[PDB]
Design an enzyme around this catalytic site. Sequence first.
Site, PDB file in Angstrom:
ATOM      1  N   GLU A   1     -38.237 -34.620  26.746  1.00 39.35           N
ATOM      2  CA  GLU A   1     -37.739 -34.667  28.122  1.00 39.35           C
ATOM      3  C   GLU A   1     -38.699 -33.929  29.046  1.00 39.35           C
ATOM      4  O   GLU A   1     -39.060 -34.429  30.115  1.00 39.35           O
ATOM      5  CB  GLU A   1     -36.342 -34.046  28.247  1.00 39.35           C
ATOM      6  CG  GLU A   1     -35.201 -34.782  27.566  1.00 39.35           C
ATOM      7  CD  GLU A   1     -33.946 -33.887  27.488  1.00 39.35           C
ATOM      8  OE1 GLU A   1     -33.338 -33.523  28.539  1.00 39.35           O
ATOM      9  OE2 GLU A   1     -33.705 -33.371  26.371  1.00 39.35           O
TER      10      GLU A   1
ATOM     11  N   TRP B   1     -33.308 -31.336  20.160  1.00 41.39           N
ATOM     12  CA  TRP B   1     -31.878 -31.599  20.263  1.00 41.39           C
ATOM     13  C   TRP B   1     -31.666 -32.586  21.428  1.00 41.39           C
ATOM     14  O   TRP B   1     -31.675 -32.172  22.594  1.00 41.39           O
ATOM     15  CB  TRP B   1     -31.106 -30.284  20.493  1.00 41.39           C
ATOM     16  CG  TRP B   1     -29.596 -30.364  20.704  1.00 41.39           C
ATOM     17  CD1 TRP B   1     -28.812 -31.497  20.802  1.00 41.39           C
ATOM     18  CD2 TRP B   1     -28.691 -29.240  20.847  1.00 41.39           C
ATOM     19  NE1 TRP B   1     -27.494 -31.141  20.997  1.00 41.39           N
ATOM     20  CE2 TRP B   1     -27.388 -29.769  21.025  1.00 41.39           C
ATOM     21  CE3 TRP B   1     -28.865 -27.850  20.842  1.00 41.39           C
ATOM     22  CZ2 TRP B   1     -26.259 -28.949  21.215  1.00 41.39           C
ATOM     23  CZ3 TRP B   1     -27.732 -27.023  21.019  1.00 41.39           C
ATOM     24  CH2 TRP B   1     -26.447 -27.587  21.209  1.00 41.39           C
TER      25      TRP B   1
ATOM     26  N   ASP C   1     -30.538 -34.976  24.522  1.00 45.27           N
ATOM     27  CA  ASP C   1     -29.490 -34.971  25.540  1.00 45.27           C
ATOM     28  C   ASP C   1     -28.287 -35.797  25.082  1.00 45.27           C
ATOM     29  O   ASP C   1     -28.428 -36.805  24.378  1.00 45.27           O
ATOM     30  CB  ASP C   1     -30.023 -35.540  26.868  1.00 45.27           C
ATOM     31  CG  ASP C   1     -29.246 -35.031  28.102  1.00 45.27           C
ATOM     32  OD1 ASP C   1     -29.706 -35.299  29.252  1.00 45.27           O
ATOM     33  OD2 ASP C   1     -28.193 -34.360  27.933  1.00 45.27           O
TER      34      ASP C   1
ATOM     35  N   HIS D   1     -30.354 -22.678  29.144  1.00 44.22           N
ATOM     36  CA  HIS D   1     -30.321 -23.922  29.900  1.00 44.22           C
ATOM     37  C   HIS D   1     -30.844 -25.076  29.064  1.00 44.22           C
ATOM     38  O   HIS D   1     -31.587 -24.895  28.091  1.00 44.22           O
ATOM     39  CB  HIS D   1     -31.069 -23.806  31.236  1.00 44.22           C
ATOM     40  CG  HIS D   1     -32.562 -23.712  31.137  1.00 44.22           C
ATOM     41  ND1 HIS D   1     -33.372 -24.806  30.901  1.00 44.22           N
ATOM     42  CD2 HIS D   1     -33.398 -22.664  31.337  1.00 44.22           C
ATOM     43  CE1 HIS D   1     -34.639 -24.425  30.918  1.00 44.22           C
ATOM     44  NE2 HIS D   1     -34.683 -23.135  31.202  1.00 44.22           N
ATOM     45  N   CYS D   2     -30.375 -26.264  29.425  1.00 46.70           N
ATOM     46  CA  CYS D   2     -30.924 -27.515  28.926  1.00 46.70           C
ATOM     47  C   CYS D   2     -31.452 -28.235  30.156  1.00 46.70           C
ATOM     48  O   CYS D   2     -32.168 -27.623  30.952  1.00 46.70           O
ATOM     49  CB  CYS D   2     -29.864 -28.314  28.161  1.00 46.70           C
ATOM     50  SG  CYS D   2     -28.234 -28.395  29.000  1.00 46.70           S
TER      51      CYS D   2
ATOM     52  N   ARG E   1     -25.552 -29.327  26.098  1.00 48.66           N
ATOM     53  CA  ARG E   1     -26.055 -28.539  24.978  1.00 48.66           C
ATOM     54  C   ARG E   1     -25.893 -27.046  25.252  1.00 48.66           C
ATOM     55  O   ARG E   1     -25.665 -26.256  24.326  1.00 48.66           O
ATOM     56  CB  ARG E   1     -27.520 -28.905  24.713  1.00 48.66           C
ATOM     57  CG  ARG E   1     -27.706 -30.358  24.309  1.00 48.66           C
ATOM     58  CD  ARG E   1     -29.156 -30.826  24.517  1.00 48.66           C
ATOM     59  NE  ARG E   1     -29.453 -31.183  25.902  1.00 48.66           N
ATOM     60  CZ  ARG E   1     -30.597 -31.764  26.277  1.00 48.66           C
ATOM     61  NH1 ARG E   1     -31.539 -32.022  25.373  1.00 48.66           N
ATOM     62  NH2 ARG E   1     -30.802 -32.084  27.552  1.00 48.66           N
ATOM     63  N   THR E   2     -25.995 -26.649  26.518  1.00 48.92           N
ATOM     64  CA  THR E   2     -25.820 -25.252  26.893  1.00 48.92           C
ATOM     65  C   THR E   2     -24.416 -24.758  26.567  1.00 48.92           C
ATOM     66  O   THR E   2     -24.245 -23.675  26.001  1.00 48.92           O
ATOM     67  CB  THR E   2     -26.116 -25.096  28.386  1.00 48.92           C
ATOM     68  OG1 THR E   2     -27.491 -25.406  28.637  1.00 48.92           O
ATOM     69  CG2 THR E   2     -25.804 -23.678  28.864  1.00 48.92           C
TER      70      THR E   2
HETATM   71  O1  VO4 Z   1     -26.978 -32.719  29.655  1.00 51.67           O
HETATM   72  V1  VO4 Z   1     -27.360 -31.016  29.148  1.00 51.67           V
HETATM   73  O2  VO4 Z   1     -29.060 -31.088  29.691  1.00 51.67           O
HETATM   74  O3  VO4 Z   1     -26.166 -30.256  30.240  1.00 51.67           O
HETATM   75  O4  VO4 Z   1     -27.012 -31.082  27.428  1.00 51.67           O
END
Ligand code: VO4
Length: 282
Positions: free
Chosen positions: A104, A168, A170, A216-217, A223-224
């Site tokens: 990403e 990991w 999204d 953060h993600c 994920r956060t």
């Molecule tokens: O969509 V996160 O980047 O909040 O896992």
Amino acid sequence: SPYGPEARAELSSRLTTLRNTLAPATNDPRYLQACGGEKLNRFRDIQCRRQTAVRADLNANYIQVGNTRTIACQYPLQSQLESHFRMLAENRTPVLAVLASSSEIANQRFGMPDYFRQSGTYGSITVESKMTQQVGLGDGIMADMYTLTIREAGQKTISVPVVHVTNWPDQTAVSSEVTKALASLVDQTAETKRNMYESKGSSAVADDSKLRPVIHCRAGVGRTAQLIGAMCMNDSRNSQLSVEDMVSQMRVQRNGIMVQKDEQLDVLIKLAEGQGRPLLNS
Ligand code: VO4
């Protein structure tokens, strides 16, 4: 039966209602608003609770879940990096957990600056990255660790440990076993860095708003939230705190999207049942 489908369905019903009522209105008093036209929110639908906002010009929130105190935030926009590094240094950040993947960050369509793997200069702030160890978390998930040294004229130089989970994806939930291993590694990294400050007699060790892990993600809600949920459940002081209360606190302190996908809540539910921790408030 306590983790049966009827109790799971009740939990989903409560959290969906809360999610729906926390959706941001235009100029919502509950949410931090952009200032002079500069973009604040990476995603217009994923906003920053005003009461717990860490800085005026960041999409970032103080999170307290039972006794566990963290900061959860979106991936900083390019315009936000100097302010982002200021928050990191001022918090004496004992660990920065980046859950956005290498793929990403590399996609320049996503506007996700490579701020922790390269050295750079952001206004008056100078940042040195050094790569340290790499750690397998299980199921093929990999962590790369860095130290970011934050320098600014007239300011105390601050070094920040970084845990970067590289793969990991999204909108997915890594396994309960992986989640526990990641939480352990992030807590241990933070504890080592806190111990350092404490061994130097640092007055920041006594401020609750400080020495908080920063997580953060991309959006800071998916994920956060899974990682924060697992870190909460790994703190022995949080005995008896239910999944319902844990997710409700995250949502009222950040936004209604915390724990984005059913699969991510499913991992929190697995971790809770492995502890005999309640799903629902009674
Ligand atoms: O969509 V996160 O980047 O909040 O896992």
